[PDB]
């Protein structure tokens with residue numbers, strides 16, 4: 001029973017999805033399926049054969065080899081990372097919770113509320129909340145009065161996040177006024193947020209630290225930066241989510257700490273995460 | 278009748294400060310610059326640090342980042358405790374006797390002398406094979422402490438990779454740093470030099486860098502950077518290698534294990550851990 005159903009989600013450079021070759025998956029890519037609906041009047045769909053690569057995919061490749069398992073990799077279609085809606089989890093967390101996946105592999109933030117319903121492996125990447133601004137924007141960080149009490153300013157500071165993930169949940173729990181203010185600046189995704197910042201439609205973009213630090217590292221003309229020296233609030237990490245009491249957790253944790261010890265994680269960081277800026 | 282948790286810790290500034298009690302057995306009332314009272318605990322431990330010598334247990338005062346973390350953990354989970362300092366003064370390694378044994382806080386936890394390790398204890402594969410580690414409370418790495426004026430590039434400096442009796446560099450015996458230099462074959466030539474000069478404690482090694490006796494100390498950046506910020510005559514050189522985290526140590530069958538990690542996650546998410554970092558480390 002070592003052929004495992006594994007859920008993932010696209011988020012460059014952690015997980016990168018490509019169309020199949022002219023007619024299987026080649027190079028450093030692995031096969032990954034995505035259930036695609038026929039129309040919106042039906043539940044009928046078809047799994048499209050795609051190809052996955054990235055930092056988290058190389059981790060899956062190493063774990064599969066060390067921990068000795070094979071897997072069926074799929075991309076989540078019901079939500080994204082994981083949100084608890086009326087006590088029902090969607091996204092990658094939901095897939096693990098409702099046992100459609102043995103594990104979730106991706107840019108998945110370890111937090112307390114997710115940890116109540118899934119077990120997480122040791123963190124493989126450090127993350128948290130970083131703030132991206134145009135170089136020179138004067139903000140101390142999350143605690144800045146520009147974020148805490150935005151209407152104390154004329155015109156007020158414009159900032160938002162991509163909702164439904166661990167960044168929004170944390171801002172909701174810690175800064176109630178800031179949160180209710182931000183919702184009008186909610187971004188559909190990271191790409192829109194970066195464009196909004198560059199087109200002067202947003203002053204700050206609050207998001208996952210590991211993704212923001214990678215985006216700042218690759219920005220054209222190194223214009224967009226993360227405040228502080230790439231500072232991280234509510235520091236956490238990305239971990240593999242497994243079902244509570246999973247028999248795989250012990251071997252996955254030991255393998256990950258083995259990889260860190262052997263400088264293999266530092267190598268993957270060099271190959272996927274380091275930028276020009 | 279006690280159901281009190283036996284907590285094992287080690288002397289390691291700024292995570293754990295160890296000071297004598299007053300003539301009456303209480304702790305000197307102290308305050309932060311804010312005017313906030315420094316929380317202190319009675320920690321029993323040996324007054325004779327000397328190796329292969331009798332250990333006379335005396336009540337001492339303990340405080341710091343790790344003690345503040347213990348108090349918060351005990352408050353959240355509703356447990357009682359008693360703290361003692363590791364009898365042999367070590368973090369913990371597995372050494373061959375045919376059989377293999379864990380020493381330090383590791384040995385104490387496995388033998389039942391402790392129910393929980395609350396200290397700057399490095400999470401690694403070797404220890405994770407025998408104990409449960411919580412989610413990390415601190416992420417840091419290894420750096421090098423030298424006297425102000427000693428010019429070194431870092432872990433790839435010719436004075437380290439090509440060892441000689443002229444330049445003496447070391448670490449702490451029976452520590453995770455020792456485990457790291459032993460495991461990695463690419464660092465065997467460095468380990469071979471270090472095994473000859475490794476100290477019993479971080480304090481002794483830091484003091485030997487002050488006394489021109491030890492040229493370079495390889496240790497945890499959270500400790501070394503703190504030491505460099507206080508003792509202006511000492512500086513940390515190079516950037517960070519073997520990035521590693523600190524976690525709480527428990528036995529694999531501990532009933533508190535799930536609730537310890539949730540409390541650590543809660544403390545990172547609500548700014549409490551960053552506040553501890555501000556009070557004690559920065």
Ligand SMILES: CCN(Cc1cc(=O)n2nc(C)sc2n1)c1ccccc1
Pocket residue numbers: 110123124125126127235236237238260265400412413414415416521522523542545
């Ligand atoms: C202390 C903050 N961290 C970040 C962290 C710690 C750590 O040991 N490692 N090991 C790696 C390899 S990446 C990494 N990131 C954290 C806190 C709670 C939950 C997860 C992470």
Ligand SMILES: N[C@@H](CCC(=O)O)C(=O)O
Pocket residue numbers: 081082107108109110162164165166167168207208209
């Ligand atoms: N990695 C985050 C998603 C992005 C964010 O909300 O910052 C999570 O797992 O929820």
Ligand SMILES: [Ca+2]
Pocket residue numbers: 392531532
């Ligand atoms: Ca117990």
